[PDB]
Assembly symmetry: C3
Amino acid sequence: LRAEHREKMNRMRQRIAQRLKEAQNTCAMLTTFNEIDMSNIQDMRARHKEAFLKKHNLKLGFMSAFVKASAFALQEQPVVNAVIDDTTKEVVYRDYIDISVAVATPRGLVVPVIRNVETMNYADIERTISELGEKARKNELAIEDMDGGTFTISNGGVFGSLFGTPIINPPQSAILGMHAIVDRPVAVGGKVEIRPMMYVALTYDHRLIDGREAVTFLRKIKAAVEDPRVLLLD
Amino acid sequence: LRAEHREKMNRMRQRIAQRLKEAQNTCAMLTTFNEIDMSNIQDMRARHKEAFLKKHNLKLGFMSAFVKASAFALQEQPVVNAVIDDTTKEVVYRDYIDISVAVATPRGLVVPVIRNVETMNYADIERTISELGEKARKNELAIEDMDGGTFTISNGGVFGSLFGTPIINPPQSAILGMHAIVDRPVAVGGKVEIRPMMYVALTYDHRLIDGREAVTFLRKIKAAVEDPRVLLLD
Amino acid sequence: LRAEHREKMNRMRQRIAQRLKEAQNTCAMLTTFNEIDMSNIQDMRARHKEAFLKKHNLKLGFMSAFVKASAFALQEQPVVNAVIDDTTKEVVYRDYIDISVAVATPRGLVVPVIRNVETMNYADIERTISELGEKARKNELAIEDMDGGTFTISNGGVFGSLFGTPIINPPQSAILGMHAIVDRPVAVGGKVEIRPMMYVALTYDHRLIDGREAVTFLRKIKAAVEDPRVLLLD
């Protein structure tokens, strides 16, 4: 039996598909990959998760380690923070860092913005994600705090993808895509151990960001997650 | 010696290159990857290949395991089966499953269609591929059975590519790309074994399919090839 | 404090971003990957690097092994050497091989051309890269020897990227992207050894090059780097 039926799409879905194709026809997107060893983050979460809950009443997750390491890399290379506006053919630098965090709730995808990430620590980031996660869950999430982001983390790794290519939020110039954590054999010190590792991806605008600047950017995020004490040093 | 000569391209190759660029300018294509362990398929082919040839006069291959697992995943998530027609800005659902199989013969690529995959088993799929493989080999393959497919398998793995990005057949919304089988060290149960594994890819339309629905789709194909008894269960 | 300031981009950067978007809107780019074992190249550099420096006054690097293996693969499949000109809708074959080498100096990226690679050896290629590397370093590099290339090597592996997708130099049809060398566990002979391996990528025009011809091309480059004695044989 061969049955097909035409259901229509509303005017809201019209604009979402319209903005999506404008993001590809504007900027020349490329993608680069790397690989992060997640051993120093898990034992940080293994021994300090109990004193964190008693003192702050929050959960200690992986997400706050990637947001704080992203604000560290952006303030070192400001060209990734930049945006090309094709109205006056201008290059708009910024001096503030607002990282948008895609948190997929039951309803669907929402992309709220964490404001002024430069001065925070892990305790401040965890407050911001938790209470704003409750806002969008019961649908009280405003429009005015969903725009103006300068960089975007995309957790598509809570479902188990190995690696993949993300899509740029069109008022920005780059996006980081984190993925699932698997145990794979690793050659460390000339021996074959098993360590939990993650593939990461970075989709960047090649009109603005150089091919070597995107590699150095993603290599700097790796150093601040394989060893989070670099945030206190250089 | 610097010699170059202009040979022309015919009007048939004109349209093939024309349809190819229309597939990129219409839909916003992204790609996601995963990894399948092919151990339960090979020992199925190791002990039952002799009773299969005596009783059916056919060869037992890898291809029929991917076609039957693809019809299983499509009937669970019908949104991958859908197509956006931009004539009336409509979303066309379908209730039938027709998987197109790219079988590269000596002449070149051909993409015939297997009709009504929902009711078949491995024995029915193997008859359909084998006799239709003989039709396109001696060039009696009609035009009327090359169109109307809803999903596409692309075996580019008979040449030995590791992984790569396929291209969407433009009346469809997704495509699966299987690749070569290599023996790689695998961390299973806390120990380092060697098991034959395959990388797979899924190129999807981001106008229609969500970013989390493409990950769940490819994760469901993996469960029906790492353990083919799920086709009898849920 | 929220400060942003508009700095302009000059008319040279206007055209670079203009040519970049024309390369995507012309040709349908896809990407395929593979993996090369770099053991036979390093012990060639381990024992012959001293007699090479005494006799030629040059350094023995990895780059000359990829340029000579690329001219070997291009003269076997001339369709990768071809270019589609959309002025008269023509397919322009060539009989000469000019490989462009992107050598990122302190100033930035430059892409000079090595002319007539068919007759050279490793000693001739190393002379051409070394003295022309000194020209672009002190900025005496002419314009007339930066155009007319037919194939492009892109070393983005001196910074440590795992793998990624390159961009086609628009008068060409393909580009090879080499990457960083890491020690990873390898299943060889049924045992788990540790060997230095590299991921490589090939971005090709799907209007002209078939999907199976790009896989066979990159598989042929692998055979001439895993065993460089094939250059004397077939």
